[PDB]
Design a protein around this ligand. Structure first.
Ligand SMILES: [Zn+2]
Ligand SMILES: [Zn+2]
Lengths: 358, 370
């Protein structure tokens, strides 16, 4: 069966030009260096070494195909990487989103049958412009969904003004790939965080941000309001499979919510949402986490990803197989067994079915 | 029939409650004219509701109800009898002595710890305790308190929060505290309280009750604190340190793989020699120096915890009395306790050797509960 990577990124050339133009994070400059995160500010100021290196791996389509060929991946569903268009002024974002989504469509056309994309949306623009962009991207060749950050329009996913956006994407039958970026306020990592490289913001901040975003969305009733909405969660839902039971217990034991009628007997539990409206990527690095994800959403709702090109080997050949991909592939084998139907499903067949790649 | 032990179960002695009643800023206990039962206001996430309640009689009561269960030893024993628990290892709840002034802290801690010992003496064989420390005081005052704690009947460990001496658990000033407790063979029960900066929950945070700070803030706090300890090499510098993590390690069993991948793929750490071949992985630490409570509410989470630390390193708890049933006239076991017992049964099977271990025999062995 076919191996599909649904969590894989590129920065197209026109997007790169935007980051070198910028004065504040997010930005790109030579010391090029990719400085995307708030946690990287202290290292940047000391260097004005900071952030992570900008490589050919972000920008080159040839490099993407080579990665796929050397890591046993047949199909990639590529997306613009964080932070997308969030920093752009409301009047300019639609035009830039258009140009970038056009570049992705054109890239996919270069390797017919091996490349599809999640489109990025001009979420700093008015809702009318966002809806216009949605209608445009659903008619671009090779587009198979939307990538969305946790901040939504700027006030998170429980923002009432975002509901028409959710409705529009759902009605268009576009899968929403939710992806972190803002992490947690750097103060939580304490006065020694610089000593630990990027480990705390990447290993903890990102998945925690995703969990909080989805929990807010769930608590605000978004999934009930937009019943046809389907969402794919980055990094196996962040921590959601592990905390789902705790969330449920805290809800049913919340005095205020129960007494104010927010916990009716017929409420759809987070477990139900996890099985009905949520897909999970398998970017989790261990069969321990992966088994929890499978138990939460079902093996028919888990999808292999690599997070290419963010985790290259540090000492091994960057042109050879990547450990950061192998770890996830091995997690699948260890959890459900090599050659099994579950393995085939997670490794690509689920994505083929859900994204109509067949 | 195997002994059932609850290792995550709390009390506030009347003297401690008296301190909170006198406080003008969180943490505090306050009575409002609307209700009769006092309000327990412990968390920074509760400040907005507290300020609104002080300025408006129509606003919702802030914090949670200060039920009699917090101070009543009789109600603790009733709870144990009605929930099939033979032994409780009780502990002062958050925020312990963290808020006390340095000068006063050691004396108060010593007295409160003495009170816990005396409570345990009331029901011999059924009650043990984790002691709390005066961590706002100088490190040598803390070490003096650990020495006293060593001498107390029924004490089997230390409970503490994530702030340490004030700079978190990776603070090198805290290393001798870990050394002293480890040398004393006192298990360290790490428990959340401080959560996350409230802005992370967004502008509609006040609409979701306590769900976000309790369901997310608490376990995330625990995960961050332990990850900091791990990255700072605390588990390597104090090889005999044994830690019990609240709420099945927060999120650690689910993120352990991600943490490991981020380490081995960190350019800075690899290039500066911080990822040597002989590094003890988080998986190794989880099997060798970490115990996990089973306060996770689902077999899904529980199975991940078991795979991470092993069935011999998981311990049943209830978090009594923080999650009472909301509906009146309710009889029998608390749902919040029953959920955890059912999670164990679903994960490892009723009457199994693993079930006996998680439900009490692990605690009996590790904490020498006879
Ligand atoms: Zn990514
Ligand atoms: Zn507790």
């Amino acid at each position: 069966p076919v191996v599909v990577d649904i969590h894989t990124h590129m920065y197209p050339p026109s997007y790169i030009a935007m980051l070198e133009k910028r004065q504040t994070i997010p930005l790109v400059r030579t010391f090029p260096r990719l400085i995307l995160l708030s946690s990287e500010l202290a290292a940047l100021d000391a260097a004005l070494l900071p952030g992570r290196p900008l490589s050919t791996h972000f920008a080159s389509l040839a490099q993407k195909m080579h990665f796929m060929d050397t890591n046993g991946i047949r199909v990639s569903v590529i997306s613009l990487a964080n932070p997308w268009f969030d920093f752009l002024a409301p009047d300019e974002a639609p035009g830039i989103a258009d140009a970038v989504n056009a570049e992705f469509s054109d890239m996919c056309a270069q390797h017919v049958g091996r490349l599809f994309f999640f489109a990025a949306l001009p979420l700093s623009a008015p809702v009318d412009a966002v809806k216009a962009s949605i209608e445009r991207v659903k008619n671009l060749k090779y587009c198979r969904g939307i990538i969305l950050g946790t901040s939504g329009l700027g006030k998170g996913l429980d923002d009432p003004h975002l509901l028409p956006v959710f409705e529009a994407v759902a009605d268009a039958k576009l899968l929403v790939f939710l992806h972190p970026h803002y992490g947690l306020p750097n103060e939580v990592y304490g006065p020694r965080s610089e000593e630990y490289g990027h480990v705390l913001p990447l290993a903890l901040g990102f998945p925690m941000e995703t969990t909080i975003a989805v929990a807010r969305m769930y608590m605000a009733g978004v999934f009930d309001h937009v019943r046809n909405l389907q969402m794919l969660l980055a990094h196996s839902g962040g921590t959601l499979p592990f905390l789902a039971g705790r969330i449920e217990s805290c809800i049913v034991h919340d005095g205020h919510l129960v007494k104010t009628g927010k916990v009716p007997k017929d409420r759809r539990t987070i477990w139900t949402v996890l099985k009905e409206q949520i897909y999970l990527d398998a970017v989790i690095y261990s069969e321990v986490g992966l088994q929890a994800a499978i138990a939460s959403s079902g093996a028919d709702r888990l999808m292999f990803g690599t997070d290419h090109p963010f985790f290259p080997p540090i000492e091994e050949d960057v042109q050879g197989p990547w450990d950061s991909s192998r770890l996830n592939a091995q997690a699948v084998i260890k959890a459900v067994g090599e050659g099994s139907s579950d393995a085939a499903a997670v490794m690509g067949l689920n994505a083929v079915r859900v994204l109509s790649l067949k």
